[PDB]
A paper describes a structure:
Stalled ribosomes at the endoplasmic reticulum (ER) are covalently modified with the ubiquitin-like protein UFM1 on the 60S ribosomal subunit protein RPL26 (also known as uL24). Collectively, we identify a fundamental role for UREL in dissociating 60S subunits from the SEC61 translocon and the basis for UFMylation in regulating protein homeostasis at the ER.
We engineered a stable mimic of the UFC1~UFM1 thioester bond by replacing the active-site cysteine residue of UFC1 with a lysine to generate an isopeptide bond between the C terminus of mature UFM1 (Gly83) and the ε-amino group of the introduced lysine (UFC1(C116K))10. To understand interactions between UFC1 and UFM1 independent of the UREL complex, we determined the crystal structure of the stable isopeptide-linked UFC1–UFM1 mimic. When compared to other E2–UBL structures in closed and open conformations, our structure reveals that UFM1 adopts an intermediate state. This conformation is stabilized by multiple contacts between UFM1 and UFC1 α0, which is a helical extension beyond the UBC fold of UFC1. Taken together, these data suggest that UFC1 α0 may prevent UFM1 from readily adopting a closed conformation, therefore stabilizing an intermediate state. Indeed, in a closed UFC1–UFM1 conformation, modelled based on closed E2–Ub structures, UFC1 α0 clashes with UFM1.
Author numbering:
A (entry chain B): 2 to 83
B (entry chain A): 0 to 161
């Protein structure tokens, strides 16, 4: 019932990662909030994309993303105004 | 990824700085400035060796006011911009704000006076590295990536002509 993601913070030149484990039914937006909290970056100016640079639709579960895209993710700075 | 390895190697080859001292700090500031010049000079040497010699920086005597030039190559053409910044008194905890005055009013990714707007990840990154990051890192991790995003856009829109 859980899935694990390897999430790399791309804004840090050491390229550190964390593995976050969440229930499969967790909304993927919560994964983004969890990852942002863990890296101490704002959720609203961060985004998650696949290891290979692909955009992820947030309106799906973690389990959905885990199978469709894969366990390896990047957390990146987002395009945001101000 | 090739991007990852490139960044890691680039930033790894920039000498880290040592002294936690800002302009208020007399002989310790002098030492910090030596470190800054050493780190900048090594970064420029690396840039020259990587065929991307993209900036020069100088300062006043006191090391509190910095000015220089940067270059961006796009579609075989070279674009040159003047840069400047002031060292805040709480440096190196507080990072300077780099300005590109000739671009003031030309992009929304910028505050007043040509001060570039970096992503929100820059400040935490800087803060957790104090005092090992200095002006060479500010260039490599701040201005450089800003140019790589903004300059092609301004060219494509015809806001800058070369």
């Amino acid at each position: 019932s859980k899935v694990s993601f390897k999430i790399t913070l791309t804004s840090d030149p050491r390229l550190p990662y964390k593995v976050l484990s969440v229930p499969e039914s967790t909304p993927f937006t919560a994964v983004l909030k969890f990852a942002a909290e863990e890296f101490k970056v704002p959720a609203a100016t961060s985004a998650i994309i696949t290891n290979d640079g692909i955009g992820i639709n947030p309106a799906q579960t973690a389990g959905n993303v885990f199978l469709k895209h894969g366990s390896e993710l990047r957390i990146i700075p987002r395009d945001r105004v101000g | 990824s090739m991007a990852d390895e490139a960044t890691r190697r680039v930033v790894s080859e920039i000498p880290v700085l040592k002294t936690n001292a800002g302009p208020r700090d007399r002989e310790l500031w002098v030492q910090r400035l030596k470190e800054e010049y050493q780190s900048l000079i090594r970064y420029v040497e690396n840039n020259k060796n990587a065929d991307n010699d993209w900036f020069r920086l100088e300062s006043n005597k006191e090391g509190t006011r910095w000015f220089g030039k940067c270059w961006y190559i796009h579609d075989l053409l070279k674009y040159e911009f003047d840069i400047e910044f002031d060292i805040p008194i709480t440096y190196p905890t507080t990072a300077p704000e780099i300005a590109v005055p000739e671009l003031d009013g030309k992009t929304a990714k910028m505050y007043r006076g040509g001060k570039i707007k970096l992503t929100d990840h820059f400040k935490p990154l800087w803060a957790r590295n104090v005092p090992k990051f200095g002006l060479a890192h500010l260039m490599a991790l701040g201005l450089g990536p800003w140019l790589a995003v903004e300059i092609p856009d301004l060219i494509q829109k015809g806001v800058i002509q070369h």
